[PDB]
Structure formats: structure tokens, C-alpha cells
Design an enzyme around this catalytic site. Structure first.
Site, short mmCIF file in Angstrom:
data_model
loop_
_atom_site.label_atom_id
_atom_site.label_comp_id
_atom_site.label_asym_id
_atom_site.label_seq_id
_atom_site.Cartn_x
_atom_site.Cartn_y
_atom_site.Cartn_z
N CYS A 1 5.03 16.13 15.54
CA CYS A 1 6.27 16.36 15.60
C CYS A 1 7.12 14.95 15.38
O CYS A 1 8.15 14.94 14.74
CB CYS A 1 6.97 17.28 16.56
SG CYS A 1 6.55 16.81 18.19
N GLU B 1 10.87 23.42 20.78
CA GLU B 1 10.46 22.21 19.80
C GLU B 1 9.90 22.30 18.76
O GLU B 1 8.76 22.97 18.39
CB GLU B 1 9.26 21.38 20.88
CG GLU B 1 8.83 19.85 20.59
CD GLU B 1 7.89 19.57 19.67
OE1 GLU B 1 6.68 19.31 19.90
OE2 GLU B 1 8.16 19.84 18.23
N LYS C 1 -0.10 32.87 23.82
CA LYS C 1 -0.71 32.97 22.49
C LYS C 1 -0.94 31.24 22.24
O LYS C 1 -0.16 31.06 21.57
CB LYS C 1 0.13 33.98 21.69
CG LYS C 1 -0.39 34.42 20.66
CD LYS C 1 -1.44 33.76 19.54
CE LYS C 1 -0.58 32.87 18.80
NZ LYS C 1 -1.33 32.33 17.67
#
Lengths: 530, 530, 530
Positions: free
Chosen positions: A295, A261, A182
């Protein structure tokens, strides 16, 4: 893949990829070019939970043939994919600039990470080493093998639309698993194309299935929920901590270890002996690469007392020079638009939270508009969502200090000496990346063993990990899994221990083991006369 | 083991250990206490070539049963040996002070290295990992196993009479080999006792055979020559380069890879930013531990121009304070006698070679005698062979600079900057150990990747390797083998690759392999509209 | 740590071990000798959630000093523990027979597994290897290190009261973590003693804390809940799947990967070509070792059609010969009592479930009593809870086939050929252990790659794993973690990637990398002419 002309390229319309078939079913969504909202990149459907179910069952049906395909042949498929990614790198670069608003420099880098990953794992097909182990019994041999898990559910963000999916997709199929993916609604075209390149490389139909949709209250959520139906043997997710904990929970009760993550608040320390211009350049790039939408982006620059004022002065100088703009029309810019509205909104809010808790704003005036222009903007700021480079001074313990904020913002924080720098660096719920600029061996050492982070840089940015080190965070940044290199094999395989008996009798470890007994000790002090 | 009272302990008389039997055959040799020649430590025979032959054949006869003893049980024998070495450490320490003239501090350290080695390899019995490897063919599995070689010939020096034999003996028997061991004539008692402790730990008779004798024109040479008769599947040697090359040659033609630890000329660099007192202490200990009788002992201290005079002044201060003496009677001394006459002779000669080539003698007056006394000597210098601490200044390219000299000597050499330090450090035929004292990250890095050495220390001595790193040299210091840790397993085992077929047909790697072909490439530039 | 005389030994009374202190706080529980409930083994308190909190905070306070204790020194502590366990093995064996009702044979084996584990990890203190990795950039070096997690929460069952705690406790402290341990209330004395042996070995106070209590609605549950307060960085659990899923969930949302060993329904296949007596003996021992109270105990014997009747006849013969009784008074018995009332109760109920779904009872009359005696019982069957050896024939798909039932019960199931044996073997929610008895290379191979299990035995029992292979299950038997050997290091450490820069410039991986371009290709077909 059907067409209709936009202004920076064709508007594509495509469906889900399930068992090889393309499936145009569900209410149409669209992705607009974040740099120019008039340009429609793609039109694509929202997969309902029944279609994700169907996709998981194709993956399940494909697993028997794919897992029995010899690992070196599966690796040859990835080698085909290395060549194909190489061929397509200029085109994927340009599509990525249009679809997610990254600079061509960074977009090429992103695609390169996938090529690097594909080469690493192509070769890994002749490795995947288990062990031969000596038995404690005669006429017995021990073995370990790495086995595939089954069907992998994967959800990925759009800030690294080729690189970060490659970290999951490639090792997953190399190790004999099948996949339901997805992808981000922020990068459906890139995702569609990538899946088609796997198809070109010879990946059998049903080994990779792609279901498009949103997240919360949409396809993303449907897919997490299917872990409760047993349709996934593994799950991997890149995104927010809060969603991560929920996926942690669902997987948890279904006896799955998810790869998570989950973002960070990445400290970058500048000690009094640092090479100032190198640290300034490293802090700047850590903050503003991808417009602060990684991130790994710098959250806080912790600056040693004796250089605070000098570093600040030089850092603001450097930030003021940042070019911002439409990267399609102005490739020389450092960063362009926000990837989506969600991140822009949270970034707007941080101005207000900052003012409210007493942070000092040094630079930044929120959204760049015609009424509120930025001196080094290139292009039309009203065609998309672009933010002023933003710099604060903050106290530890505050929301601007502890909480992740995607977008072009950074905090300066005065610290005094190495022990304080380490403690303040750890004073966050996160532990993804980290960095210290120093020339003193001892200070680097202390930071390295005193930081709580999955990743540390000495005299380098918090961003720009190499593709062949383990990537992952501690604390709120993840749950122990690592991606890339040999370290990701634990994520997509399980250990099978085998003992083969040849002794023709039942012999019991720990009880029948033929341990040898000592002889009588000689009194050596007496014999030698000491 | 029969007795007769000496003055620092009993005088022992013992024979060779062959197939479990003690064998007192051959002309008697004796070992005198190097600190006091009146004290006779041992009387022992010289094994003739026929007895070494017989010992190799016992080892060959014992190999079938020992190699088939499960590795974890062989490891339990080593665990027994850990406990026994622990028990005997105070006694072995005291015997070592008497027999080879080491200080109690260093003797205990020596025994500890064997304990450390024994624990490491006791556990290794449940490891010895080979690999499981995925076939490129269906219905096929690949494997690797570690197998023992056969009978190992071992020759060891006496400067580390328990530690360095343990590096060879312990992994050799752990990995399922049998051994013929020719120990130094400088430490026959320690060697006899060690073999008896292996016996106590449960090692079967004939797995370790001990043949005493000399080297050149004696048992040492006989044993090397037996490689031409096929009686050894492996050989290990610690000693001089020149003997090493000869053993290299003999083994070479017999298709054996010998383990050769061959001494060195170990550079220690002191950069202008070094912590002076730490470097002075490290240089001093590197030079004078074991009275300079280690393969790893400092050969040359390379001192950066701007600190040359200050370092020299402080180093001579430190050397002048060295206590030398009889370590049995004065345990506080840094070093005692020479281990044997051979080393004393080569050390005497270096004074003359130095003067002849223009070296400057800063400190040292050759052998310490009543006529030629040393201000910090403790004991009777005529009872054995003791040397003045000796310090030279030398030019690169000279015999004192390039050639190994066991004993208490060291050279100072002025260098200017890091590039010169590295080049001068490499200007030797050797490459065992190395060291740099600096605080600058960059200088340590350059030295580390620019030195040609098996081992490097940053802000530490050239001596004192930890037992669980790979030990070994490049250039004239060895031939590629490493001892200790996991790295020594390559020395005492060979790889056995096995392929198991289940397909019920002949299928050919590289020719029948079922590689998958690409599909047709889609023209993505055209479809996307670039 | 105080006494009061029982009949098979002293009745002990002791408290929790928190920060070195013994703490007698909470409502008293007692443990009765399961073979003779008149004999009281121990009286001990139930730790409340505040005391578990306090214990987790001592562990947190102890972690700084313990994690900074060099790994080789932490390993020396485990080496001390190897010697101490060896010394205490006869005593721990006898205590284990009294406290949990195992045979002396099995109890010694249990203690030995801890000794084996302690030796393996003592040595591991000089290993714990991370990697050096080549950078793709010049003047840059990459590294990985294994780092400890923090405070480990551990909950263990009582069927393996020394072995299975050792799998968790030992690697956890070796790798630099501190521990809070909630042991089974079925084996509090063994647990107390083990903690005291770690204390004797030199483990610093507060590195191991022991909190006694029950599970659900008690100390077990309190401790799982503390994961929500951040007081554990890791969790490990042995017990039921149902509790496991809940621990999975709590850990999940706290971004922890718990170690979960959760039981099984272990298939043992007997093919038509098997050595019948060997398979009969392996099936029998798999079923009745520990009175069927192992996670690894045989659930179903799948027997190939052509030997079904002969195998059944020989298996019932073998079961009929089983000695059952009080192992303290009759050590020659195969098995004694149930460990606790809970397991006996679930086992009683399985007779009813079986009858209700149409299983055929071949042997077994439920609880052994004086009114309902067993022909080979030795001792007083009323003094504890003892079960008839029990054998069923069952169809796949039934509750007796799929559901784990601790205790002395086993099912026979007819299968025809290897494909069916594999499918029926997989037809369970579990995947812990597995076994096939065959002589045919091809059948062993198919089973090995067709079974879904963490562990497989060829011509060996489902029970009796060696201590140095990875232990763990798939499906409902676990979540991916493995215990023992090198494989458990992933459970108690995290990867720290470090990149060190020396280039003095900001250089970007994937973008600045100095990749070389090809030269122009020569037209070899033309040049060679073929």
C-alpha cells in the site's frame, strides 16, 4: 494439518477453525507457490455464509468469558505468543517465501512486525488507561473506562500475511474482543499456523475463529453482508479503495466504524539540495520492495527541475541493477513473483493505459518470459508471474499518476520548487504515505505541514513504517482509524462514562453548580495614581 | 491601601495579607522607583517569623474548605481572574514600569504571561486527570487520583513580578492547595495588587496569604526555616543557585520536593551557515532584554570560526545602537535601570574579575553617569543605577564564562564546528535555556540531543519561552521540577492509588493471579516440510 | 436582522450566513412559539442544495487561513466567546424559553453547557497534544501531530439548541476546521444569534456558515448528499436512529466517520436497598425534564420486586404533583409544550400502541385541552401542544418497552434481583444512558460492568451529564464517537506520523534494527546448589 509431499515442502490440507474445532467443509481451493506453479502449498475449503454465521456465533458465545478475563492475564497470553513467534520466526520466514513469494529478508521483517506488535500489546494489558475526572458537584466522582465492543470481523490481504493481520488480531483480543478472521486465499497456510500459535499461547477456543475463502462472490463478501444481521460489533479490512467504500457503507448503516487501510499513490519528492545517492536509494527501495506490492509503495517520484536529468540518469542506473527471481532458490534478489493473478493483470493493463495517454516508457518490457527475458533474472520465468522493473515519465492528472498499480512500476515527474512539489504531491485521490529528500529545514517543514498524508518521511523511504507509530491514510486511503501503538485502542474499545453520587440529594449540573461570584472591583488607576 | 502623592504616581502604604485581614506590623521598608530614586512607590512592613507562622496556620485552617471545593469551581475562580487581569493589564503594565524599571512592551508581556497561565489553569479545573487501571484480579478495580499537598510556601524574585509568581500561585490554588507567599521587596505593590485581584475573583480569605519582607536574615529566611516546623507541605523558589541549594537541603530533610528555578549561563551558538542578521538580532535580544536580568539571558555567544569576525563586527554595530534610559519617560528604550542594588554590585564586580583573568573588553565603561555618559542614554543617569551595554571576548573555563551575572553583559567565544560548539555550550555549571542558529537539519539535531539544557531554541533567542511548555533547568539550574502546562501538576499534587475489591475473598497479586499456561508446541518444521 | 412586533417579543426575519454575507434566498418558513402559536418568533428561508454547495465552498475557501491560524489564537477567539456568552446568558435564556418552550431553569443550564464547552476548548488551544516517540533506529526521530480534517457538516436538533450545537461547533473550529451548520427549524433565531456571537468573538467570515431549512426532503438531506461530492471531510448529526443509519451509510462510502448521537431507551434500576425518595425523585426528573424530550430521558424504571408496590405508590404521588404549563407565563412549571408537532404526533400514537399490546395505563389522558384539563396546568392548553404526564406498566419485549418516544411518558417494570435487572436493562436496541439506585457496593459494581451503555449513573438520574465527560452511546444510540472533553478531538482531527532521518543511510525497521543477543546462561541450580 495432514500432509502429502511437494517439492519445496509438504502440501498441507486443513479446514476452518470454528469454536476450537477444525472444519473441512466446502469446495476445495488450492494455493500454488507463486514462484513455481508446480508446487502446491495448501488445499483448503471455501466457507459458505452459514459457516461464517456459525463462526460469528461461536465468537459471540466466547466473548462473555474472554471479556471478563482480566486484561493483564490476556496480556500474559500475548507474552506467550511473543515467545512462540520468536521460536517460529525462521520457519514462518521460510513458509512465507514459499507461499507469497517474498524475499527471506522481507519475510523475516514481516514476522518481526508481529513480534513487535505482540510485545507492545502484552504490556498494554496493565495499561488500557481510562480517566478519573473531578466532578463539578460535591460528593460526586466521575470515571471513564475502556470497554470491548464484541465480535470483530477481519479481512486481510496476503502481501503482509503475518504483520498486518497481527495489527488487528492482537489488539482486538487484548482489549477483550473475540474475532472472526477471513484471511487471504493467497496465504492460507501462514494464516492457519498463526491461529495455531495463538492457540498454543493459551487463547481460549472461540476467541479466534478462522474462515477460509475468496473475496468477491465468496466468503469475504458473505462476511461483510453479515454486518446487516448484527453479528459484528466491529470490522477491519485491508485492500482496495473500491471494496473499502462498500465495506464503509455496510458498516455505516449498521452503526459501525470500520478500520479501513485502503492503499495509496505515495509521493516521494527530491529537492535540488538532496543527497542524490541517498534519495536514489530511497526511491528505488520505495518502488521495488515487495516488487511494488505494498500500500505504501512509491507511486510518483517528484524531482526538482535543476537535478531532474542527473537524478533520472542515476535512478535508471540503479533500477537496471535490480535482481529479480525465485526467492526460494535465489535469496539475493530484490523481488520475485506477483502474489496473485489479479495484481499481475492490473499491472499488464497499466502499460496500455500509459501508452494510450502519452506517458513515456523509459524502462520495462512487461512480463518476463523465455521469449522476453530480463538480463538480471535468476530462475525460470515461466514457472510463475514476474514483471520487468518499469519506469515512466508522466504528466500530473493522468491515470498512471493518480491510480494505484500494485507491482514493479514507478513514475518520474519534473517539478520546480517546493510549492509545486507540494501541490503535485497532493494531486492524487490518496493520502497514505509520503516522503521528501532535502537538507533545508524550511523545505522539510513546508512539506510536512503542506502534504495531506497520514504518514511522512524526511530523508527516508515511503515504505518501512515503524511498528509503534500510528498507521493509516487520509482521503481515499482510509476513514480516520489508525492501527498500531496506543492509537489503535480507539478501534477496538468504546468509552463508558460513570458518575457516582454520594450527596444524598438530586443536584443538577449546569444549574445547581456552586459557582463563586466576584467581589466589588477596586479602582486601581485612582488608588495607584496610575 | 492608603495614599500620599509621589511624582510618577501615589506612594502606597499597605500591610501583610493574613487570613483576609490586612496587618501593618513590623519595621517599615520602602521601595524606590529604580529609574528615579526621588519617587517612592511603596512603604510596607517586614513580617517577623511569628507572623509567617501565623500566616501558615491561616493557610492550614483554610485548606479543608478549599480542597473540598470542586476543582471546576476553583477553575471558575481562575476564569474570573482572567477577566480581571485583562481589565487591569494597562494599569499593571504602568505600575510595573514604575516599580521594577521594565519597558512597557516587556511589562505588558509579563502581565500577559499571567493571563495565559490563568486561562490554561481555569480550564484545567475540569481535567486534573487520574487513571482507571485494569486489575490482574477478577472482581477488582484500580484507580489513581491527584490530591493536593497542603500549604505551599512560595518565594519569588522581582524581575518577573507578575508572570513568575502566577506560574506558582495559579496551579497551586487550582489543585486545591493554600499558599503563604513572600514576594520580592523589589515589587511589593504589584504583589499586593495581584493578591487583591485573586480576592476580587472570589478566592476565599486565607487561601492566599502574603507576608512582605527581605530575604537573607529576614522574612525569606524565616519562611524557609519554618519547613523544619512542618508548616509547609511544599515550597517553591525563584532566585540564585546558592540560596536554592540551601532551600533544597531544608526541604530535603523535611521530605519535600521544592520547585527551584535557579538561573543559568545560557549558550547561544551561531554556525557558519546561519542567517547572520537573524542570529545577530537573536543574540542581541537574548543579551539585553530586561537589561540582561533574566534567568534565561544569554551568557555566551559561541560563534563558528569562519564567521567569527563578520558576526563580531555586526554584533558590536547592533549593540552600539541600543537605547538605554528611564522607561517611564522614554518607552522606546531597550532597557532601563537595574532592579536592585545587589544586581548592580555583582555587575560592577564582573568588570574587575574579567580584567583580572585576561578577558578582552570590546564595549562598555561600567555605570552610566554624568561624568561617564552613554551616547544613546535618554534621561538622568544619576537618578538611578544604569549600566553600559557590555561585551567581552573570553576563554572557556573562566569566571566570566561559567558564572551567572545579571545585567547588560555578554561574551563572544570562537568555536570550530558543531562538536566543539556542543562541548563548549555544556562547559558551564548550568543548563537552563540554550539556542543554535543554523539552517542544516543535522547540526540542529546534534545540538538538540547533545546539549544538556531544560530548554532549547532553534533559530530563536534563549529568552521568550511560551507559557504552555515546561519551564525548568538541569544541572545547577534546578532539581527536576517543571513549571507551566500539564507538567507543573506533579509539583502541587500527589498520587493516591486505590484498589476496590468485590470478590468476597482475600486474593493475592503475583501469587493467586490466574495466568494461562501454553498448550503443547506442534513441530511446524516437520509438519510444513520446512 | 430586521424586526416586526409580536406579543412575547419581536418577530425576526433573517437569511442564511454564507461567507460573512446574509443571504435571503428560498421559500420562507416560520417558527411559532410552541407555548402560544399566535406568537411568531422568526421568518427564515429554506436553503436549496445549490446554496448549501455554495456554503461548503466558502468553508473550503476559508480553511487555508483558519487552519494556519495558530491554535492558541483560535483558542483566544473561543475565550472571547466565553465572555460574550456570559454577557448574553440572560437574553439567550429568555429567547430559548420563547422559541423551544423550555423552562428558564433548564434554558439557563443549556446556555451554561455552551459556556462550559467554550472555556474547555479555549484552553485546549495550547494543548492538542501529539507525541514524540523514540525511533528503534539511531539518528532518527518519530513524531505525531493532530491535523484538521477540512470542512465539517453539522446537523442539530432543537431540544438543546445552544448546548448540543456547541459540542460540535466549538471543538470543530478550535481544531482548525471550517463548518457548514444546518440548525433545527425549531430554533432558527437561537442559531442565528449564536453564529453572530461567534462573529463578535472574532471568528473570521466563512469559518462558520449557517444554512436554514428542514430535514428529510429539505436542507438536511441536501447536506448529507453533498458528502458524495467531496464537500465535507466530516459530518456530525443529532437525531433519530433511522436518519442516523442513512447518514452512516453515505459517510461510510465517502470514507468519513460521522459523529452520530441517535437517542435511546434509557433504563433506571431501583434495587430493594435504595433510598426510595431519592430514587423516586431521580426517576421523576429523568422522565419529565424537558417534558421527556431528551435522548437521555428515562425509558423504563426497573423496580426490584420487594419494593415494587411502595415505589409505584410514591412515584405516582410524585408524578401527580408535576406542574405543567406555559413557561413564559409560569416559570415554576416542570415542563411546557412539545417542541414541534411531529413529536406530539408520535407521542399521541403511543397511547394506541400501548392499549393494543396490553400495557396497563396507570396515569395520563393524552393531550391536555380545555375539554380534557390537567389539574396542575398553568396557562392556556389550547395555545400549544401539551401532554399529560403518562405512566405505564409494561412487559419486556413490547413496543412501549423498546422504542424511543419523545414526550412525557414512562414505564414501570418489575424485576427480581440484580442479574435480572441487568438483563432487562440491556433488552433494548439502545445503549445511551443508564442508572441504578442502590447502596450496596457489589450491586453498583455488577450493573456498571454488566450494562451496555455509553454512560451510567450510580444514585443519579439518566439525565444531567457533566460537560467534561465523554457523551455518546453504543448499539443503536451511536457508532463509537464521543463528544465533549479530550475525547471529541478524535472526531475533528487525524493523526499525522512523521519520521525524520539523520543517519545519512537507508536503514530498514524490523530488518536492520541493532537488537543485542543474550550471553550464554550460567547453570545457577548447580552453582547455588539448590
Amino acid at each position: 494439518h495432514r500432509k502429502a509431499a511437494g517439492k519445496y515442502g509438504n502440501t498441507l490440507e486443513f479446514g476452518h477453525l470454528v469454536g476450537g474445532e477444525e472444519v473441512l467443509e466446502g469446495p476445495l481451493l488450492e494455493r500454488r507457490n507463486p514462484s513455481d506453479r508446480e508446487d502446491v502449498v495448501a488445499r483448503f475449503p471455501e466457507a459458505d455464509k452459514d459457516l461464517v454465521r456459525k463462526a460469528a456465533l461461536k465468537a459471540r458465545e466466547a466473548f462473555a468469558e474472554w471479556s471478563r478475563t482480566p486484561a493483564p492475564i490476556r496480556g500474559q497470553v500475548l507474552f506467550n505468543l511473543v515467545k512462540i513467534l520468536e521460536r517460529e520466526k525462521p520457519t514462518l520466514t521460510r513458509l512465507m517465501v514459499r507461499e507469497v513469494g517474498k524475499t527471506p529478508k522481507e519475510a523475516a521483517g514481516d514476522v518481526q512486525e508481529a513480534i513487535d506488535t505482540a510485545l507492545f500489546f502484552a504490556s498494554e494489558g496493565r495499561r488500557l488507561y481510562g480517566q478519573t475526572v473531578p466532578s463539578e458537584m460535591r460528593d460526586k466522582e466521575l470515571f471513564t473506562f475502556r470497554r470491548p465492543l464484541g465480535v470483530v470481523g477481519i479481512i486481510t490481504a496476503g502481501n503482509f500475511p503475518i504483520a498486518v493481520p497481527s495489527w488487528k488480531l492482537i489488539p482486538a483480543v487484548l482489549t477483550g474482543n473475540t474475532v472472526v478472521w477471513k484471511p487471504s486465499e493467497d496465504a492460507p497456510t501462514l494464516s492457519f499456523v498463526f491461529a495455531k500459535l495463538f492457540e498454543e499461547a493459551g487463547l481460549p477456543p472461540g476467541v479466534l475463529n478462522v474462515v477460509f475463502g475468496g473475496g468477491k462472490g465468496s466468503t469475504g463478501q458473505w462476511m461483510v453482508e453479515l454486518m446487516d444481521e448484527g453479528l459484528f460489533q466491529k470490522f477491519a479490512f485491508t485492500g482496495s479503495t473500491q471494496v473499502g467504500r462498500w465495506i464503509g457503507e455496510v458498516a455505516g448503516r449498521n452503526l459501525i466504524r470500520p478500520t479501513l487501510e485502503l492503499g495509496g499513490k505515495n509521493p516521494l519528492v527530491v529537492m535540488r539540495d538532496a543527497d542524490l545517492d541517498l534519495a536514489v536509494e530511497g526511491a528505488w527501495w520505495s518502488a521495488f520492495a515487495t516488487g511494488g506490492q505494498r500500500c505504501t509503495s512509491a507511486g510518483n517520484i517528484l524531482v526538482d527541475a535543476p537535478i531532474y536529468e542527473e537524478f533520472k540518469r542515476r535512478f535508471l542506473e540503479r533500477v537496471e541493477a535490480t535482481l529479480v527471481g525465485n526467492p526460494l532458490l535465489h535469496p539475493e534478489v530484490t523481488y520475485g513473483p506477483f502474489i496473485n493473478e489479479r495484481f499481475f493483470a492490473r499491472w499488464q493493463e497499466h502499460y496500455r493505459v500509459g501508452e494510450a495517454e502519452g506517458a513515456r516508457l523509459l524502462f520495462g518490457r512487461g512480463r518476463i518470459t523465455r521469449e522476453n527475458p530480463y538480463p538480471r533474472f535468476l530462475g525460470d520465468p515461466e514457472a510463475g508471474l514476474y514483471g520487468w522493473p518499469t519506469v515512466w515519465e508522466v504528466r500530473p492528472g493522468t491515470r498512471l499518476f493518480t491510480e494505484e498499480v500494485f507491482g514493479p512500476t514507478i513514475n518520474l515527474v519534473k517539478v520546480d520548487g517546493i510549492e509545486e512539489a507540494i501541490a503535485v504531491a497532493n494531486s492524487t485521490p490518496y493520502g497514505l504515505s509520503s516522503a521528501i529528500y532535502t537538507n533545508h529545514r524550511h523545505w522539510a517543514y513546508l512539506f510536512k505541514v503542506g502534504i495531506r498524508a497520514g504518514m511522512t518521511s524526511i530523508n527516508n523511504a515511503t515504505v518501512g513504517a515503524e511498528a509503534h507509530l500510528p498507521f493509516g491514510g487520509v482521503k481515499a486511503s482510509g476513514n480516520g482509524g489508525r492501527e498500531s501503538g496506543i492509537w489503535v485502542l480507539e478501534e477496538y474499545t468504546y468509552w463508558h462514562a460513570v458518575n457516582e453520587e454520594y450527596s444524598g440529594r438530586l443536584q443538577l449540573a449546569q444549574m445547581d453548580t456552586g459557582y463563586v461570584s466576584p467581589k466589588a472591583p477596586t479602582p486601581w488607576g485612582e488608588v495607584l495614581g496610575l
